[PDB]
């Protein structure tokens, strides 16, 4: 009961670690129960709609003894009022409205998908002589394209970006996910393969996929140059909207370790020091009790990139010589960590005067030999024996007790 | 199977009748209103029949009398893969749909197509999968070795077959069923080894069993419309579609019908609070039950003389003299004290809570002076003041100390009355201030 | 000690040079 | 040091393990038999047995009915969905107000899910993409596989990849040298960041650099989730999550509310149903508080009537102060709280009673020392006379400015006379109302 | 921008002890109301309390969103100020009860801490690299000070951001690493044989000395109500200009509150509070009144500010009268400042403010003609004839508006009373309500 | 008002110019681009950036259309072929505009009227980009 307060008192995380904060999946997907590995896209909804075969090879698909295919051409095509073959007047009058240059195009537009007609386009030429000119506002937009800054009309154009930039949009952190994620809902009919076709089809339609994503580079370069294929001849790609950040580009949030350091009031008081301590060119050994304090603060320092090694009884003997003869040569090592009992007992650590203490609290005579291990001959500047911890918590009656030990041993 | 603990009704298993269509005193949860049981026993089996279309039943009656209980024990007793709509009244004024359009998808949420099929299924434990790959990866050899407890076999897999095995990845004692035609692989879970858990499937590999599917009108009222896909049954987008499908979709069930290949089942609408449309829903409703492909429609109200909606007139139970012509109504009738006490035994064992003598008694009395659904509301509430001081039954002071600390509409009333400054009027004069 | 720098990867790609003289446009 | 807005001097209901109630406890003073009554209702909650069991909460103006509720909400902790309403957001201009009533009924409604989550991790090595024979065909991808290479700590894999896993492995610019993190549950991918072991200072891009992640880089990891009923039904309803072209489509579409079918909801009940079954799931029901519940119209108070009685829905608080008022969307019936008697025969009325001098001296008491303002016991009493000649709010709300007055004069102890100056510069109802009557021009 | 009708007043004119001065800062007069909204501004600057209910009551023509606006004056820069008025509610891609919480929501700010580094030296060399199609960009960039030289690695953005205002290796730019600005200072290297494409008239400036690269720490606020609509959707920012939020869920706003609770446990953020001014709050449904009083006891509430004219009239969407048309559960937590009218003196004043603000010189007689047709009607009449004789005073070419152009301008434009006594002499002219007029004259 | 750096007129040739030392791996590094400008009274070669051509080919200018440069955005456009090479197809789509009168260099003072609610349009939409 005693050291779950020790060890709440130094990180809360030494219970549980903070993990991913992810959508749940609402997903029956393929899991594994245990040269490569081949991963395939296998989610589905746990939600199934299963459908009778009878209306799907009645009703949707066309068969001999129903009239799908006939009513659908007659309805598309016989009776379209922008086919060329039977109304070649209101053709010409809409290519005279629109400018045009060809008149199946109005039959190709009503007999396309809005999506892919999205996709499909291209910015085709118009005839000068049509009643389809250019509003005002559209041309100051087509003229503010690539206009460089300190310019008037463009500058005039770009307030949303101004406000991006002005408000540092682009480093702000991403607060809300969604609380579950999950895919369409699947519709199966059993015994039946055009239904997968279909249903494969239109969840993975490749004009759309390919859309909403990019060629590789070099597969682009193999396509143009060693198959020979023109640039306007690639699929057209590269149509999904960018985020706004990196950190929206997901809604799979890491663990953030600002927030592993700020729910340690330890840590985050060792890390408002150690800023300081940096800027002032200087040299500090920090001493623990468990190991698990080790871990966090190498993961710690990982993030501060400070030149740091680690010093414990778990290591071996031999490189116990070349830790402390690179500490004692090159300045560049900032950050020495060690356990109490392990780098207390004679180690030849004058380069040192400020030694930090996270949680050793343990008995005064073994406290008392670990800044020793610095408080030496050959020390060159003022010594400061640095030691942190949280008021109202088992420490103190630790404290006190190292205290009562302290007196005890200084009366006799 | 969807489980929900304690509900209102829950208590319902349906009609309690015999073999003659006679209500037994108490049987499945309901007592009392015999009159109105063996007019919903008779309803139940108009439905079951299946060969009468369009009825209207009016339910009227005084209110927490056996109105919703009725058609609670109509569903239950009905069984499933009939349709049963249970709308409310004011479920149908919406944003994006006509209340037209939405009555015509709840009546046709009501009737059902029965479609039996046969399909072919292998389900078993896998012993051994063996994939030999090629550096591309074009052409693949696969061997399948699966078994139930009765057989074993060994199988050749196609390139699309292993390109399925390896996606949703199965390994060695996975209980998987396989569709030969689809390609759907679903993995039931691991068989019973130690070195979630399914049991191994028994007898054959290569089944052929029959599924049975009922499938409603506005299902395929749906997918036949262009405009939207299936998904609407879920999103809710299906926006108004228009009568050319529905004339559609009830020639090809008519030609199904003829051919023997579906099936028609007819179901209930169930309309609770009726009173809440306007004049044009109910003569749509009016026109709604003279068609071949309408359910029988039950309609639930406690109003007596009021007002109808989208009109300036009053009318008996809220609906006009045109649609209480094509309604047979029936009367539900209050309760006496010993429906009650049999009421309130019942909802006190079906939450479990174990009730005294003295505290029945004295539920009884005060639901006879009060209400029933008073009394049956300070069950629950007094059973949490039973186990506040540790105890489990239930005594009479319990009940007392429940009764002091909620309010019914009657002392609620006359607290509201002596005290009338203190709150907000219908001219919005209030007092906040406790001096002068 | 000192950190590697990560390895830059072009294969394929159209490569715009800016000199102090002249610049370049190395297309496919 | 802190921010306090007419609460959050209220900890919980202040009871004993018997359930009476304390005087003055929880920051809660006097309401002995509503506290009580509230905190049996707080055990029905806790029992997690019921469905459909709805309180209202009757009294006047300013009488502690909205803090009972928010002293319930703290009583359940954290871990209970409260949903707290008022009588005007049911009606929305995008939805039916039936649909918004289902929506916040199945909001009330949350569940504790441990899923576990199949986790492939690293940091990207190689990326090689293998192309097809015909890129043109018009069906099929440009690219068969992609073979990516992910290392860890301890540990090295190469992955072949499907093109739907490249497509979401693309559209979050992965490149060679990150660490990256690909969940095979929805084929959703999130880049962690630029890999450490390189270099650190030449990027002009402020991205974060991440160490190498321990274990394998093929992982099964269990995490608790908290969602409700309502966010499966949104999920479903807008199915975003996927990589097909649906969910990818559903993300960047304007999100609207439907008309969410009761046909999605037993589905997502019977899922549900099942995930408890198995063990993963456990359902925890909690509290929709419907504020001002005079404002609902006959329309929403009818299908009241009938989502109570459902097996799934939450445990309903109302609240009200009108004696006896005619209901909205209606003409004639004039009926207690304005509510109509067919929703008030399923409830259980809870009253709320009046303050004397003394309880309303030490809530102002109270307040001032949660907004930590000195105050002395002439002006307190001055405080409390004036608290009982106008309102309890007037007197609440007039503390702040009595502190700004005596800040203002060097001073921390709030005097007599800066209670007379904050009476002075500032009016209540009555004294302006009096105003309002004795003016020519309309004030 | 222009000349408005409250371009006068910059604060509330109060001194450090709260007392107003007589003439101060634009605000004449007004002593009691001035002082009780320097009590509002002082307790809003200390931001410790949140959601009062502050009502503003008087007379039209008295001083009510001067008020107001003096507030505003007064409370400076980087504390978010939402004025609306009390139409603006109704929506037909808003419930009123959205509308009212992102008003609610706009008003108060997240003031969020920044690390960036500042990048500036002279471009040496740059190399782009891009696929066939310009998807995919990569590159370094080559930048030296006259102490360094620094190799870095650009992203898309980057690139982007670099081909506007495109630089020539040689020209002298600035780089925001958090924000991704580039701005170019200048051209340095002055190249003999510039292409002669562009209009290469470049500022010529020197190459930067020392760091290359200088960390700096930035402060930017940003309301809750926009980080709100940045988190509803994958084009949120786009939103915050078309206004195309419709409805956000709520729970995109509790995880938002927690993460604003977040971030200011870490430090990385803290809250401002600001005020939310409800002009014309009479103009409102009681289901916005029925919001407003659950809204306001909120932790995340700004400080209310409601302005009304009215009397005892009747409360919007209700049957039944009420003292400035707002029900007695919203009156019961709202502090009322009251308004009272203006003497022969401080309209003077006001007219003599209105005529120093518009750059017109009056005459001492002119001025108390204003001030004798301010007092006989209405102040805002008098206020408006100024501008009007200024015109008239230059249109006989003299810089004095004189008696007689006040004269001209009365006996040309019309006040209240004068219009209703012309309406009721001439009733035969006019619509009236029955939609019965006589066109003919004969 | 604003002031634009314009060169215009029909093109007379299209060179792109490669480096002296190209690098290997590609194909025709280009150097600068040279292309010529003809007008009427007068004609004038320009050298252009490298990184033209690109939006050249891309715009799809060939020998003898008449093209539209703006100094410092670089952005090619054309309007169309030159009305003297409108008599060697019988059939053809593109309209055939006349030789632009002026120098093939000039300085054009424009004056541009647009209200404030023409800018809240214009900035709240977009700029045409490349999302769907
Ligand atoms: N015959 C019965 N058997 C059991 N419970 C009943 C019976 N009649 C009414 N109840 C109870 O009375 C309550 C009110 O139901 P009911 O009167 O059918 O609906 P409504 O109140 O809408 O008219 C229900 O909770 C039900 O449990
Ligand atoms: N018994 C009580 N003890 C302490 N404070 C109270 C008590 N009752 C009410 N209050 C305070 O008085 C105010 C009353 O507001 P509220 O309860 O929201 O309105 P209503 O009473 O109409 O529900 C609250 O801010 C609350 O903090
Ligand atoms: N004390 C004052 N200081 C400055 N201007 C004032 C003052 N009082 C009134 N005004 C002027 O008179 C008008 C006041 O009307 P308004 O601002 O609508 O408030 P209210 O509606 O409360 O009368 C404003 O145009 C303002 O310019």
Redesign the interface.
Same mark, same amino acid.
């Given at each position: 009961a005693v050291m779950q307060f020790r060890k709440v008192c130094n990180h809360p995380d030494l219970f549980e670690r903070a993990d991913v904060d992810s959508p749940f999946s609402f997903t029956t997907f393929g899991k594994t129960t245990s040269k490569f590995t081949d991963l395939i896209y296998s989610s589905r909804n746990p939600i199934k709609y299963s459908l009778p075969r009878l209306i799907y090879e009645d009703l949707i698909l066309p068969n001999y003894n129903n009239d799908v295919d006939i009513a659908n051409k007659l309805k598309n095509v016989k009776f379209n009022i922008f086919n060329p073959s039977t109304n070649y007047e209101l053709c010409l009058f809409l290519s005279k409205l629109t400018g045009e240059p060809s008149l199946n195009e109005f039959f190709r537009v009503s007999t396309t998908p809005l999506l892919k007609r999205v996709i499909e386009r291209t910015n085709g030429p118009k005839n000068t002589d049509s009643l389809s000119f250019k509003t005002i506002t559209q041309e100051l937009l087509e003229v503010t394209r690539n206009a460089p800054s300190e310019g008037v009309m463009a500058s005039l154009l770009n307030v949303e970006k101004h406000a991006y930039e002005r408000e540092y949009l682009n480093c702000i952190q991403r607060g809300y996910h969604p609380n579950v994620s999950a895919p369409p809902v699947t519709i199966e009919v059993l015994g039946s393969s055009h239904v997968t076709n279909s249903i494969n089809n239109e969840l993975f339609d490749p004009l759309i996929s390919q859309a909403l994503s990019d060629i590789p580079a070099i597969t682009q370069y193999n396509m143009h140059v060693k198959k020979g294929i023109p640039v306007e001849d690639f699929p057209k790609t590269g149509l999904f909207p960018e985020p706004l950040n990196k950190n929206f580009s997901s809604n799979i949030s890491m663990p953030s370790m600002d927030r592993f350091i700020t729910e340690s009031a330890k840590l985050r008081k060792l890390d408002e020091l150690l800023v300081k301590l940096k800027s002032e060119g200087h040299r500090v050994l920090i001493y623990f009790q468990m190991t698990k304090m080790m871990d966090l603060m190498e993961e710690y320092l990982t993030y501060r990139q400070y030149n740091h090694i680690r010093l414990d009884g778990s290591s071996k003997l031999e490189d116990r010589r070349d830790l402390v003869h690179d500490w004692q040569t090159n300045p560049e090592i900032f950050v020495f960590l060690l356990s109490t009992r392990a780098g207390g007992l004679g180690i030849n650590l004058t380069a040192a005067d400020t030694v930090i203490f996270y949680d050793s609290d343990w008995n005064p005579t073994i406290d008392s030999q670990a800044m020793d291990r610095a408080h030496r001959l050959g020390q060159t500047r003022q010594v400061t024996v640095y030691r942190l911890l949280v008021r109202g918590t088992i420490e103190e009656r630790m404290r006190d007790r190292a205290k009562q030990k302290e007196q005890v041993q200084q009366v006799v | 199977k969807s489980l929900s603990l304690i509900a209102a009704h829950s208590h319902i298993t349906g009609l309690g009748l015999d073999e003659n269509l006679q209500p037994r005193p108490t049987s499945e949860g309901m007592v009392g209103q015999l009159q109105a049981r063996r007019a919903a026993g008779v309803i139940l089996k108009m439905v079951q029949n299946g060969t009468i279309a369009g009825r209207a039943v009016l339910v009227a009656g005084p209110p927490s009398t056996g109105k919703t209980a009725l058609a609670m024990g109509v569903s239950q007793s009905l069984g499933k893969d009939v349709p049963f709509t249970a709308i409310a009244g004011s479920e149908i004024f919406s944003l994006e749909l006509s209340k037209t359009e939405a009555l015509t998808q709840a009546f046709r949420k009501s009737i059902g197509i029965k479609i039996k099929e046969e399909t072919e299924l292998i389900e078993g434990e896998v012993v051994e999968i063996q994939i030999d790959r090629s550096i591309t990866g074009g052409h693949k050899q696969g061997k399948l070795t699966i078994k139930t407890t009765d057989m074993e076999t060994i199988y050749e897999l196609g390139n699309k077959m292993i390109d399925g095995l390896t996606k949703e990845k199965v390994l060695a004692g996975d209980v998987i069923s396989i569709d030969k035609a689809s390609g759907k692989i679903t993995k039931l879970g691991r068989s019973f080894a130690r070195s979630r858990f399914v049991q191994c499937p028994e007898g054959e590999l290569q089944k052929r069993k029959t599924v049975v599917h009922t499938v409603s009108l506005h299902e395929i009222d749906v997918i036949n419309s262009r405009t939207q896909g299936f998904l609407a049954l879920f999103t809710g987008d299906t926006g108004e579609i228009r009568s050319e499908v529905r004339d559609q979709i009830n020639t090809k069930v008519a030609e199904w019908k003829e051919e023997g290949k579906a099936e028609i089942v007819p179901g209930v609408l169930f309309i609770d609070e009726v009173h809440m449309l306007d004049i044009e829903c109910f003569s749509f409703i009016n026109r709604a039950l003279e068609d071949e492909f309408a359910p029988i429609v039950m309609m639930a109200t406690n109003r007596g003389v009021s007002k109808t909606r989208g009109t300036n007139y009053k009318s008996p139970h809220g609906l006009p003299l045109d649609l209480l012509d094509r309604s047979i109504i029936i009367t539900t009738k209050s309760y006496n004290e010993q429906e009650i006490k049999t009421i309130l035994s019942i909802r006190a064992q079906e939450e479990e809570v174990e009730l005294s003598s003295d505290a029945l008694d004295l539920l009884t009395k005060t639901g006879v002076e009060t209400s029933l659904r008073y009394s049956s509301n300070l069950i629950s509430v007094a059973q949490q003041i039973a186990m506040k001081r540790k105890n489990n039954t239930v005594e009479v002071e319990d009940v007392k100390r429940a009764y002091l600390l909620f309010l019914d509409s009657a002392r609620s009333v006359k607290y509201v009355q002596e005290n009338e400054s203190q709150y907000i009027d219908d001219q919005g004069n209030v007092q906040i201030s406790i001096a002068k | 000690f000192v950190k590697p720098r990560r390895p830059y990867n072009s294969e394929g790609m159209t490569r715009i040079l800016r000199r102090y003289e002249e610049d370049l446009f190395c297309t496919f | 040091?802190?921010?306090?807005?007419?609460?959050?001097h209220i900890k919980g209901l202040g009871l004993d393990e018997?359930?009476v109630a304390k005087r003055v406890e929880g920051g809660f003073v006097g309401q002995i038999?509503a506290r009580?009554?509230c905190g049996?209702?707080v055990?029905?909650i806790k029992?997690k047995?019921?469905?459909?069991?709805a309180?209202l909460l009757?009294?006047?103006?300013?009488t502690g009915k909205?803090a009972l509720a928010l002293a319930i909400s703290q009583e359940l902790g954290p871990k209970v969905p409260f949903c707290?309403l008022?009588?005007?957001?049911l009606?929305?201009?995008?939805?039916?107000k039936?649909e918004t009533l289902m929506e916040n009924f199945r909001?009330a409604i949350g569940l504790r899910?441990k899923?576990? %989550? /199949?986790v492939?991790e690293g940091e990207v090595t190689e990326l090689?993409?293998?192309?097809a024979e015909n890129?043109?065909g018009?069906? !099929? %991808? &440009?690219?068969s596989?992609?073979?990516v290479g992910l290392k860890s700590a301890k540990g090295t894999?190469?992955?072949?990849?499907?093109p &739907?896993?490249?497509?979401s492995i693309?559209?979050?610019?992965v490149?060679?040298?990150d660490v990256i993190?690909?969940?095979?549950?929805?084929?959703?991918?999130?880049? +962690?960041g630029?890999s450490?072991?390189?270099?650190?200072?030449?990027?002009?891009?402020?991205?974060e650099?991440?160490?190498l992640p321990k274990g394998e880089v093929?992982k099964?990891?269990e995490?608790v989730?908290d +969602?409700?009923l309502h966010?499966?039904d949104?999920?479903?309803?807008?199915?975003?999550?996927?990589?097909?072209?649906?969910?990818?489509?559903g993300?960047?579409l304007?999100?609207?509310?439907?008309?969410? &079918?009761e %046909?999605?909801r037993?589905?997502?009940?019977?899922?549900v149903?099942k995930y408890?079954?198995?063990g993963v799931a456990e359902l925890i029901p909690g509290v929709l508080f419907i504020?001002?519940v005079n404002?609902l119209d006959?329309?929403?108070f009818?299908?009241l009537?009938?989502?109570? /009685?459902?097996?799934?829905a939450p445990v309903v608080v109302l609240a009200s102060?009108? !004696?006896?008022?005619?209901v909205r969307g209606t003409?004639?019936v004039?009926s207690?709280?304005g509510v109509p008697?067919?929703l008030?025969?399923?409830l259980?009325? +809870?009253?709320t009673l009046?303050?004397?001098?003394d309880e309303?001296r030490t809530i102002i008491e109270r307040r001032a020392t949660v907004?930590?303002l000195q105050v002395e016991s002439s002006a307190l009493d001055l405080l409390a006379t004036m608290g009982?000649?106008?309102?309890?709010?007037?007197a609440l709300?007039?503390l702040?400015?009595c502190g700004?007055?005596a800040? &203002?004069?060097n001073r921390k102890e709030i005097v007599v006379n800066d209670v007379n100056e904050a009476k002075?510069?500032?009016?209540?109802? %009555?004294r302006?109302?009096k105003?309002?009557?004795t003016?020519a021009?309309?004030?």
């Amino acid at each position: 009961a005693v050291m779950q307060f020790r060890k709440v008192c130094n990180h809360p995380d030494l219970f549980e670690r903070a993990d991913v904060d992810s959508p749940f999946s609402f997903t029956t997907f393929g899991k594994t129960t245990s040269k490569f590995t081949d991963l395939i896209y296998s989610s589905r909804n746990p939600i199934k709609y299963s459908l009778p075969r009878l209306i799907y090879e009645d009703l949707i698909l066309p068969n001999y003894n129903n009239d799908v295919d006939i009513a659908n051409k007659l309805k598309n095509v016989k009776f379209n009022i922008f086919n060329p073959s039977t109304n070649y007047e209101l053709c010409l009058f809409l290519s005279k409205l629109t400018g045009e240059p060809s008149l199946n195009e109005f039959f190709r537009v009503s007999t396309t998908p809005l999506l892919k007609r999205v996709i499909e386009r291209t910015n085709g030429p118009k005839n000068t002589d049509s009643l389809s000119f250019k509003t005002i506002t559209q041309e100051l937009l087509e003229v503010t394209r690539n206009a460089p800054s300190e310019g008037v009309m463009a500058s005039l154009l770009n307030v949303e970006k101004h406000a991006y930039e002005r408000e540092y949009l682009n480093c702000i952190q991403r607060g809300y996910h969604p609380n579950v994620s999950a895919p369409p809902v699947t519709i199966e009919v059993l015994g039946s393969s055009h239904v997968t076709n279909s249903i494969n089809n239109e969840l993975f339609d490749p004009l759309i996929s390919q859309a909403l994503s990019d060629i590789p580079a070099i597969t682009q370069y193999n396509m143009h140059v060693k198959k020979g294929i023109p640039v306007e001849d690639f699929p057209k790609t590269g149509l999904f909207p960018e985020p706004l950040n990196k950190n929206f580009s997901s809604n799979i949030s890491m663990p953030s370790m600002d927030r592993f350091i700020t729910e340690s009031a330890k840590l985050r008081k060792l890390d408002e020091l150690l800023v300081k301590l940096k800027s002032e060119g200087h040299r500090v050994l920090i001493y623990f009790q468990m190991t698990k304090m080790m871990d966090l603060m190498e993961e710690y320092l990982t993030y501060r990139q400070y030149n740091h090694i680690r010093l414990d009884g778990s290591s071996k003997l031999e490189d116990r010589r070349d830790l402390v003869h690179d500490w004692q040569t090159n300045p560049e090592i900032f950050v020495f960590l060690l356990s109490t009992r392990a780098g207390g007992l004679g180690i030849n650590l004058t380069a040192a005067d400020t030694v930090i203490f996270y949680d050793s609290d343990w008995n005064p005579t073994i406290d008392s030999q670990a800044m020793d291990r610095a408080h030496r001959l050959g020390q060159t500047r003022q010594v400061t024996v640095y030691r942190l911890l949280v008021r109202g918590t088992i420490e103190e009656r630790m404290r006190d007790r190292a205290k009562q030990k302290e007196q005890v041993q200084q009366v006799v | 199977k969807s489980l929900s603990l304690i509900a209102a009704h829950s208590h319902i298993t349906g009609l309690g009748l015999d073999e003659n269509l006679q209500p037994r005193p108490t049987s499945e949860g309901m007592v009392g209103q015999l009159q109105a049981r063996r007019a919903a026993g008779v309803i139940l089996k108009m439905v079951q029949n299946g060969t009468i279309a369009g009825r209207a039943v009016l339910v009227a009656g005084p209110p927490s009398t056996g109105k919703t209980a009725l058609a609670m024990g109509v569903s239950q007793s009905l069984g499933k893969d009939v349709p049963f709509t249970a709308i409310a009244g004011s479920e149908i004024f919406s944003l994006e749909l006509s209340k037209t359009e939405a009555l015509t998808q709840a009546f046709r949420k009501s009737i059902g197509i029965k479609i039996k099929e046969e399909t072919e299924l292998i389900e078993g434990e896998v012993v051994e999968i063996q994939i030999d790959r090629s550096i591309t990866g074009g052409h693949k050899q696969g061997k399948l070795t699966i078994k139930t407890t009765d057989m074993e076999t060994i199988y050749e897999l196609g390139n699309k077959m292993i390109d399925g095995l390896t996606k949703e990845k199965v390994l060695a004692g996975d209980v998987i069923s396989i569709d030969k035609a689809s390609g759907k692989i679903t993995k039931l879970g691991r068989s019973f080894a130690r070195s979630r858990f399914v049991q191994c499937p028994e007898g054959e590999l290569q089944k052929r069993k029959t599924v049975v599917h009922t499938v409603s009108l506005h299902e395929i009222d749906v997918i036949n419309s262009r405009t939207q896909g299936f998904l609407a049954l879920f999103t809710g987008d299906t926006g108004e579609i228009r009568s050319e499908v529905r004339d559609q979709i009830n020639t090809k069930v008519a030609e199904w019908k003829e051919e023997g290949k579906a099936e028609i089942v007819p179901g209930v609408l169930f309309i609770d609070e009726v009173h809440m449309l306007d004049i044009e829903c109910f003569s749509f409703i009016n026109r709604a039950l003279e068609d071949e492909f309408a359910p029988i429609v039950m309609m639930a109200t406690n109003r007596g003389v009021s007002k109808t909606r989208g009109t300036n007139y009053k009318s008996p139970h809220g609906l006009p003299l045109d649609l209480l012509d094509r309604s047979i109504i029936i009367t539900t009738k209050s309760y006496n004290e010993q429906e009650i006490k049999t009421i309130l035994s019942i909802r006190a064992q079906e939450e479990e809570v174990e009730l005294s003598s003295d505290a029945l008694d004295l539920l009884t009395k005060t639901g006879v002076e009060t209400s029933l659904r008073y009394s049956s509301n300070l069950i629950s509430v007094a059973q949490q003041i039973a186990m506040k001081r540790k105890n489990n039954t239930v005594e009479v002071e319990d009940v007392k100390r429940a009764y002091l600390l909620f309010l019914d509409s009657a002392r609620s009333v006359k607290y509201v009355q002596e005290n009338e400054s203190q709150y907000i009027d219908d001219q919005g004069n209030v007092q906040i201030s406790i001096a002068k | 000690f000192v950190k590697p720098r990560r390895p830059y990867n072009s294969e394929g790609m159209t490569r715009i040079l800016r000199r102090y003289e002249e610049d370049l446009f190395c297309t496919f | 040091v802190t921010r306090t807005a007419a609460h959050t001097h209220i900890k919980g209901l202040g009871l004993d393990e018997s359930g009476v109630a304390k005087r003055v406890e929880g920051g809660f003073v006097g309401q002995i038999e509503a506290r009580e009554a509230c905190g049996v209702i707080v055990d029905l909650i806790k029992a997690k047995k019921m469905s459909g069991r709805a309180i209202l909460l009757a009294g006047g103006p300013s009488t502690g009915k909205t803090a009972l509720a928010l002293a319930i909400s703290q009583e359940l902790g954290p871990k209970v969905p409260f949903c707290p309403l008022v009588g005007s957001e049911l009606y929305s201009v995008e939805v039916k107000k039936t649909e918004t009533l289902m929506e916040n009924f199945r909001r009330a409604i949350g569940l504790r899910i441990k899923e576990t %989550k /199949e986790v492939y991790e690293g940091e990207v090595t190689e990326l090689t993409p293998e192309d097809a024979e015909n890129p043109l065909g018009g069906y !099929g %991808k &440009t690219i068969s596989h992609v073979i990516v290479g992910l290392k860890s700590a301890k540990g090295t894999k190469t992955l072949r990849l499907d093109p &739907t896993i490249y497509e979401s492995i693309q559209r979050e610019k992965v490149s060679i040298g990150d660490v990256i993190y690909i969940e095979a549950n929805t084929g959703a991918v999130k880049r +962690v960041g630029r890999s450490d072991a390189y270099a650190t200072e030449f990027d002009l891009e402020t991205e974060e650099y991440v160490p190498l992640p321990k274990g394998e880089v093929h992982k099964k990891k269990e995490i608790v989730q908290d +969602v409700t009923l309502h966010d499966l039904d949104v999920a479903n309803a807008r199915p975003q999550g996927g990589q097909d072209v649906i969910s990818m489509m559903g993300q960047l579409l304007k999100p609207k509310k439907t008309e969410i &079918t009761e %046909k999605l909801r037993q589905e997502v009940n019977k899922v549900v149903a099942k995930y408890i079954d198995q063990g993963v799931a456990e359902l925890i029901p909690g509290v929709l508080f419907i504020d001002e519940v005079n404002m609902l119209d006959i329309e929403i108070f009818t299908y009241l009537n009938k989502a109570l /009685e459902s097996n799934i829905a939450p445990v309903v608080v109302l609240a009200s102060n009108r !004696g006896m008022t005619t209901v909205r969307g209606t003409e004639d019936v004039i009926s207690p709280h304005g509510v109509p008697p067919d929703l008030i025969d399923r409830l259980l009325i +809870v009253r709320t009673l009046p303050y004397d001098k003394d309880e309303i001296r030490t809530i102002i008491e109270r307040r001032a020392t949660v907004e930590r303002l000195q105050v002395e016991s002439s002006a307190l009493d001055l405080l409390a006379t004036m608290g009982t000649e106008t309102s309890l709010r007037y007197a609440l709300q007039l503390l702040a400015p009595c502190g700004i007055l005596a800040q &203002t004069s060097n001073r921390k102890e709030i005097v007599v006379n800066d209670v007379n100056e904050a009476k002075l510069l500032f009016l209540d109802a %009555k004294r302006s109302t009096k105003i309002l009557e004795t003016s020519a021009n309309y004030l």
